[PDB]
Write an enzyme that holds these catalytic residues in place. Structure first.
Site, PDB file in Angstrom:
ATOM      1  N   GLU A   1     -79.832  58.020 -15.815  1.00 31.08           N
ATOM      2  CA  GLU A   1     -78.682  58.128 -14.946  1.00 31.08           C
ATOM      3  C   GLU A   1     -78.055  59.470 -14.739  1.00 31.08           C
ATOM      4  O   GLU A   1     -77.337  59.637 -13.758  1.00 31.08           O
ATOM      5  CB  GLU A   1     -77.603  57.141 -15.395  1.00 31.08           C
ATOM      6  CG  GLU A   1     -78.195  55.731 -15.452  1.00 31.08           C
ATOM      7  CD  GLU A   1     -78.114  54.957 -14.164  1.00 31.08           C
ATOM      8  OE1 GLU A   1     -77.762  55.657 -13.121  1.00 31.08           O
ATOM      9  OE2 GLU A   1     -78.282  53.769 -14.112  1.00 31.08           O
TER      10      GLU A   1
ATOM     11  N   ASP B   1     -74.608  57.288  -5.463  1.00 31.88           N
ATOM     12  CA  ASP B   1     -75.825  56.958  -6.160  1.00 31.88           C
ATOM     13  C   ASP B   1     -76.998  56.870  -5.132  1.00 31.88           C
ATOM     14  O   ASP B   1     -76.829  57.134  -3.915  1.00 31.88           O
ATOM     15  CB  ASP B   1     -75.622  55.695  -7.032  1.00 31.88           C
ATOM     16  CG  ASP B   1     -75.544  54.355  -6.299  1.00 31.88           C
ATOM     17  OD1 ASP B   1     -75.738  54.389  -5.008  1.00 31.88           O
ATOM     18  OD2 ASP B   1     -75.302  53.313  -6.853  1.00 31.88           O
TER      19      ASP B   1
END
Ligand SMILES: [Cl-]
Ligand SMILES: [Cl-]
Length: 164
Positions: free
Chosen positions: A11, A20
């Site tokens: 991540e 994202d």
């Protein structure tokens, strides 16, 4: 290695609000704020989550705190899911981390939709599960990551992350 390290690798860590892979407002270590197209809505969820007026920026400690909470919720989701729990309980320690990773990424509901793969993991048919897992939007959208997770399930080691 552990789940924390694995997710930190998958991540990254960003201290300011970002979008994202799907274009959703996020911060920290993959901490999704909102699915809404509004930066304001995202800033508001941010403040609510941290307990302060942040103005889209957080500190490392605040990032870590959201992280711990998110990991914890993932595990909890698993244990509370009828389809997920029995799988997770059947796995070894290494592979359990792989399952957590996917739940953190896609949510308990999303992961619980991989019925076939789940059954295969439950049966310990690593190679077959790996092939079934690759036939998914998940894999096609985030191939590098998906491959790391899949290899983990296939091999029962952290090797896919050991060079990273
Ligand atoms: Cl929160
Ligand atoms: Cl990826």
């Amino acid at each position: 290695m552990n789940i924390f390290e694995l997710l930190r690798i998958d991540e990254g860590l960003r201290l300011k609000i970002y979008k994202d892979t799907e274009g959703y407002y996020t911060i920290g270590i993959g901490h999704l704020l909102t699915k809404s197209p509004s930066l304001n809505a995202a800033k508001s969820e941010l403040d609510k989550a941290i307990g302060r007026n942040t103005n889209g920026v957080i500190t490392k400690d605040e990032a870590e705190k959201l992280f711990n909470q998110d990991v914890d919720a993932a595990v909890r989701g698993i244990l509370r899911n009828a389809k997920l729990k029995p799988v997770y309980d059947s796995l070894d320690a290494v592979r359990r981390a792989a399952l957590i990773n996917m739940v953190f990424q896609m949510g308990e509901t999303g992961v619980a939709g991989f019925t076939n793969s789940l059954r295969m993991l439950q049966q310990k048919r690593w190679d077959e599960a790996a092939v079934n897992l690759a036939k998914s939007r998940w894999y096609n959208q985030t191939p590098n990551r998906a491959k790391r997770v899949i290899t983990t399930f296939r091999t029962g080691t952290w090797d896919a992350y050991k060079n990273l």
